[PDB]
Amino acid sequence: LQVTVRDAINQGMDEELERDEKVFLLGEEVAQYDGAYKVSRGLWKKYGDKRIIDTPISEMGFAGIAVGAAMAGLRPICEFMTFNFSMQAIDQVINSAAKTYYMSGGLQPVPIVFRGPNGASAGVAAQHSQCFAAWYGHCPGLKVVSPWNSEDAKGLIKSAIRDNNPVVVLENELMYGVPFEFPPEAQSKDFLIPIGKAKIERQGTHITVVSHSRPVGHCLEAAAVLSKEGVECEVINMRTIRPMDMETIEASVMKTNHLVTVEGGWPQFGVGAEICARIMEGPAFNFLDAPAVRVTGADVPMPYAKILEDNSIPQVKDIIFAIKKTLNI
Amino acid sequence: LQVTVRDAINQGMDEELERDEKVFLLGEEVAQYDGAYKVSRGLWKKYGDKRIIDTPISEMGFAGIAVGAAMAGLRPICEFMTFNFSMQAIDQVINSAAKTYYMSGGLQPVPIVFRGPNGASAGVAAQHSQCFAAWYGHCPGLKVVSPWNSEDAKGLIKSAIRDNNPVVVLENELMYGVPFEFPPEAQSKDFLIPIGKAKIERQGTHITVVSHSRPVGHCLEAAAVLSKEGVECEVINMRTIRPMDMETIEASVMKTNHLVTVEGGWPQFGVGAEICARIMEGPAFNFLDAPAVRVTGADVPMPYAKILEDNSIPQVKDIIFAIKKTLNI
Amino acid sequence: MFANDATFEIKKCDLHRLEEGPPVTTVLTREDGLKYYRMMQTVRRMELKADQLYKQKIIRGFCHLCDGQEACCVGLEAGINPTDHLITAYRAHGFTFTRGLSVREILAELTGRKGGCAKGKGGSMHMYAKNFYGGNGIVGAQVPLGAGIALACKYNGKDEVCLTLYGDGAANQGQIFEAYNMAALWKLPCIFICENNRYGMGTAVERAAASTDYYKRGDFIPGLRVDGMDILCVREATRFAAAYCRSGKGPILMELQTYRYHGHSMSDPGVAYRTREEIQEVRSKSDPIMLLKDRMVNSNLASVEELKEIDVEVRKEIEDAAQFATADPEPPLEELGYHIYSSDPPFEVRGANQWIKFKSVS
Amino acid sequence: HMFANDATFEIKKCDLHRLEEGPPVTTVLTREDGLKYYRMMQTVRRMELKADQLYKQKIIRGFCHLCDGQEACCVGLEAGINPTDHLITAYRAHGFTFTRGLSVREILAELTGRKGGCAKGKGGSMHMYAKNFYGGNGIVGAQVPLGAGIALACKYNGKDEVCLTLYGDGAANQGQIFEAYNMAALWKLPCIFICENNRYGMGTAVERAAASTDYYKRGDFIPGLRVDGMDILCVREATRFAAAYCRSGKGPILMELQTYRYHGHSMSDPGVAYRTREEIQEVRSKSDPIMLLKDRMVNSNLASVEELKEIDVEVRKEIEDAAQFATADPEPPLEELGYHIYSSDPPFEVRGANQWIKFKSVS
C-alpha cells in the first residue's frame, strides 16, 4: 500500500509515544491545530496535554525547555515550524544539547530530537526557503539526518527517538504529501533505520550520484531518462548528514569512476563541498576518471517569482546536464 | 613602528568615526569599560555616549537595533563579545541584514558591520571556542572577512565600515596582543583593503598553503622550518571568506601543483571543504599533482585541559606533517 | 449641503503607568472622513481581490490578509506623518498602501511580476516603501529593528517617531522584552504596537500567553489599550502616543484591539479554532468600514450616495490593478542575480550547476 | 560552659510582589545547623581564595569566576531545599557544586584541568555537574530556559521536586528569560526563578543596564520576593518559603537575592574601574556572610569564638590538601581526547588536526 511521507512520520512518532511514556512532543500549533503541516495529526486527541504540547511562539525558550526536560531524563521531540525559525534557538541546539555529553565528562546525556520542514518549499521567498543541512552537519555531538521517502522517514525518526543524543531531523515540506510504496517490513513497530548508513537507491555502473532529501526524487527521474541512452547511474541516498556514510560513496566511485553531488541548499560550504573534500582526501581519488561536480541550488537568497524560483533549485535538466558534462557524453 | 592587531582595529574605528558621523559603535563593555578585550579603548572618551553605546546582555535585541539603525541610514558597528554569543542574534544577521537588499529588489540597503573575536582562545572551553567562518561564509547577501596581521585588521575594518552591505569581521582574540610592523601607507587614514582579495604572504614553488585568521602565522612558521630543508611554500592569506579569492589560489596551484589548506575551525563543511570543492571544479584541478588535503581543528567540542586543547587546534607540527604527505618528500 | 465636521464620542482607553489617556471626544472633518473611507475601502477591496487571485492560483506561497484591521492601518497613517516611520510583520498590504504604494504595485508583487514593487523578488511579505520597512516574515524580528529605527530618529535629532507592530502571538518572543528595555533605558521615540486580533496563527490569546493584557507587558514602559475597530480611536491614541514620543519621554505601548476576518494565511480554512459565526458576529456589529459609514451618514458628513460613488471608483482602481498585474511579464530570468549587494561593481553568481552563470548588478 | 541548643534571630523582611504573606521575620537556628552552615561558607570562601592564588600562578587557565561574598547564597539555598530537588546556574558555580555534593579535590582538580577533576579535565570552571546540578553554563541566559524544563520534567514525573534556576543581574535582560517566565506561568511549572543580583553585570552596573532594577518584579505576572543575600538566614527562610509555594502546585515564583562579589568580574578583570575599593571595603565590614553569622552565633551562645576558630583552621587546612592534590594530580591522557562525544554508542573514530590523526571515541 501507499503511504505519504506525512503519515510515515506520524506512525513513527506514534509508535514511540506508545512505547515509552518518557517521550513527549511540543512545538507551535502542534496539538489542537494538528500541526502546521499536519504531521502530528490526532496525536493530541489520543495522548492529551501531558505528552503533546502546544507552545507559545517563543522558539528560543521552548528549545531550551526541551533541552532541559531531556537533561532531567525525559525524551522530548521538539518541533520547529520550520528550521528557518530554528535560528532563534540555534544556541540552544548547539551549546546546550550538542556539546554537553562532552563538556560534562560523559555524565549528562541530552536525549533530544529536533524535527521539521527544512529547505525550499514553494513561493515562500527568502526568509523561509532556507536549507540547514550544512549548518547542523558541521558540529560535534549532533547527529543530523535528512529523510526523503516514507520508509526513510518513519525509519529515520523512530531511530532518532531511541538515540540518546541530539538528533536534528531535516524533513521536507514538499515531500510530506508524496505517497511511496510502503514495504511490509516498514509497517512494523520495530522499523529502525541506522543513522550513519547511506542507501543505494539505484544500481548502475557509469557514474555515482549522491544527494539527500528531495533532490533524490530528481536523480531517480534524471537516471530514468539517461537509462534510455544506456547510461547507468548509481543513485545514493545519503539519509544521514552527520555522521555521513562516506564509504558507500567511495565504494560506488571505485565501481564507477565518476561522481556528481546533488543538494538543495546553497553552494558555498555546502553538503557538496564536503563530500568532495572527503573524496579527494580518501582512497577513491585515484579512481576518479573526471572531476566530481556539485549541483546545488542558486547562490542567491530565494526569490519569489515562479520563473526565478524554479531556476534556483535543481531541475532534472540541471542534473542531467552535469552528468552529461562529467561522462563527457 | 610595530603596532598590535588590537591597536590597528582601534585606529581604524577611530579614523572612520571621525570621518563620518553616521557611524557609531555598539555592544557590551565597549564604552566605559573600554571594550571587553580593550579593543575600543579611549573611544568612548573621544566621542561620548551618543556614538559609543554600552548595551545590556541582549544580543538578539541589539543585533536587531543596529540593523534597524542601518536601514534607517545610520552606519552602525555592532560588537559581539565573542562570536559564540552572536548565535543568539544570528537570525538578525542572516534574515534581517543579509537577505534584505535582495528581497527589496534593491530598495533597502543594510550598511551594518558585526565584529568580534572568533574561534579558539586559551582554555575557554566548549561554548566559547568555536570558529564561525564556515557558518557565515555560507549565506549569500553577506560579506565575511578574517584578518591576520595588523595591516589586515585596519584595512579590513575600514573597508567594512565603507561597504554598504552587511559585513562579518571575525577577529581572533589571541592575535590582539600580537605586534607586527606597520608599513607607512597603512598608517595613512586613507588605507582600505579590498574585500575579495587574498594576498600572498610568501612566494614559493613547491606547495600552495592557504589559510585565514590565526593559523596564517603558523603557516609562515612552518614554511621557515620547511625551507631550511629545500621546500618553498607559497603561504596565501585569504583575508576575505565570502566573496573569497579563488583566482589567486588557482593561479598559485597552477604553479605549485600542490595544495594544503589550514583553518582553525571544525573539519566537516569547513573553510577547507569549500576551497577543495572549488579547486576541483575549477581550471586548477588539472594542474594538481596530488590530492589537496586539509588541516583543521579536531572534530571535537573544544576541551579544557592543556594537552587536550593543544591537540585540538593545528600546530606547526601538523601543517608540516601534511605538507610532507602531500609533497611525498 | 453638508455639515463640515462633527464631534464624536470614542471609548476611554485603559491606561497603564499614565495619569491621562487620549481624549474621549474627537472632531472629524468631512474632508478627512471621505479620505479615510476611500482608504479603508481601497485596502478592503484590495484584499477581497488578492484572495480571489489566490484561489485561481495566480498568487503563491504566502498571503495573509488584513481585513478587519483596516481601522489600524488607516488610523495609524491618520495620526503619524509622512516623515515618521512604520515597521510591521507580514500582514502588510494595508500599511504598504497607506505609505505611498499604489494598488497596481502591491497586486503586481503578489502575482510576482516585473512591475511589482519588489520586482517580483519578495512576494507578499517583503514589500518595502518610503519609510516603511516591511514586511517581515520572521515573527518578533521586526521589534528590535523598529527600536533601531527609533534610535536613528533620536540620533539624527529630526524629531520623528517610530511605530513598531507585532501581533499578539508574537508578544512572547524574547526579542520584544529586550527591545522594551533598551527602548526605555535610552528613551527612544518608539511606539510599540500590538495588533491583538485574538489569535496567534491558530492558538487563541489565552492558550499561549499567561497574561493577556499586552498593553501592560512592557511593565516599566507606559502603555494604553485601544479599540482597533474604530478609526477615530486609532487616530486619537496614535496622535496622543506620538505627542508623547515627540516630547522625549521615551517608548510607549499601544494595544490595538482588533480582529481578522480571514484565517491566518490563505491555507487556513480559518475555522478550526473559532466558529464561523463568531467571525460573522464581528463583521455584523463592529466592522470598521461599516462604522465610519454610520457616523458619517448620521451626522450629515456625507450621503449614502457619495460613499456609493466611492465604492464605485474603488471598484475601478481594483479592477485595473488586478488586470494590470495578471497581464504583467514575470521578471526576466537574466535578472535572478540582481541586487545582492548595494553599491558594488558587477559580478557572477552560480546557478543550479557550475556552468549556469548569472550576472549580479547592484 | 553550656552552649544553647538554639536561638531566634530576626531576619530582614522581604519585599513582596503579588504575594499575600511572605516568609516569616523570625527563624530558629539550632546549634548543629549553625556549626555546619558556617563550616560550608568557610569552605567556599577558602576554596575561592585558593582558586585565586592558583590562577595567579598559571595553574588555572581560562575562566575563573569566584563567588566570594555570595556564600550566603549557595548554603542559604542548599539549606532551604532537599537533595532530591534540582538546581541549575550560570558560570559562577564553584559554590553550588560543593554545596551540591562535589568535593573540593574534585573541583580544584577540574579547575587545574586534571584527570581527577569532575569532568575529567574537559570542562573548566564553567562546566561542572553533579547529582541534580545541571551546572555550570557559560551562555548567559541559556540556563533559564533549561531550568524551566528541568522543572517541567518534575511536573511530568509527578514527584513534588522543584527546580532552582539562578541568573544574575546581567542576564536579567535576556529575551529567553521572559520566554521562560511566560511558559512557567502558563504551565504552572515548579520552578524558583532566582535573580542573583550582586549589583554588577560584568563591568556594567545595574542602573546603566536595567531601566528597572526591581528584579523581583521583572517577571511581572509571576509573584516575587526580594531577599537579603548576605544573610544566610533569610536566604534559607526565603528559599524554604518559595519551595513550599512551588511544591504546593501554585506554579513558579521569583526570588531576588541582593548580594556581592568581592573579586572583580573574573580573574582577568581587576574589578576596580567600575567601583571603588572602599565601596567593597565597606560591604565586607557591614555585611560579610561569615562574620555576620559568627556574631549571630557567639552572641547567642550557640558557640564560642575558640570553637569557630577550630573550624577555620581545619577547613583552611583541608583546602591546602586539596590544592596539593590538584597541582600534583596528572593531566588527562591524550587517548581520551575524543571520548564522550555520543552516549550509548559503539566506539568510533574522530578526526584530528589532519587526516592521519585519529582519536578513538567511546561513550
Ligand SMILES: Cc1ncc(C[n+]2csc(CCOP(=O)(O)OP(=O)(O)O)c2C)c(N)n1
Ligand atoms: C520566529 C517565528 N516562529 C514561527 C513562525 C511561524 N508563524 C508565522 S505567523 C505565526 C503567528 C503569529 O501570530 P500573531 O502574532 O497573532 O500575528 P497575526 O497573524 O495574528 O497577524 C507563526 C507562529 C514565524 N514566521 N516566525
Ligand SMILES: Cc1ncc(C[n+]2csc(CCOP(=O)(O)OP(=O)(O)O)c2C)c(N)n1
Ligand atoms: C549570551 C552571552 N552574552 C554575553 C556573554 C559575555 N558575558 C559573560 S558573563 C557576562 C556578565 C554577566 O552578568 P551577571 O548576570 O550579573 O553575572 P554575575 O555578575 O553574577 O557574574 C557577560 C556580559 C556571555 N557569556 N553569553
Ligand SMILES: [K+]
Ligand atoms: K531522543
Ligand SMILES: [K+]
Ligand atoms: K558598512
Ligand SMILES: [Mg+2]
Ligand atoms: Mg494575532
Ligand SMILES: [Mg+2]
Ligand atoms: Mg552579577
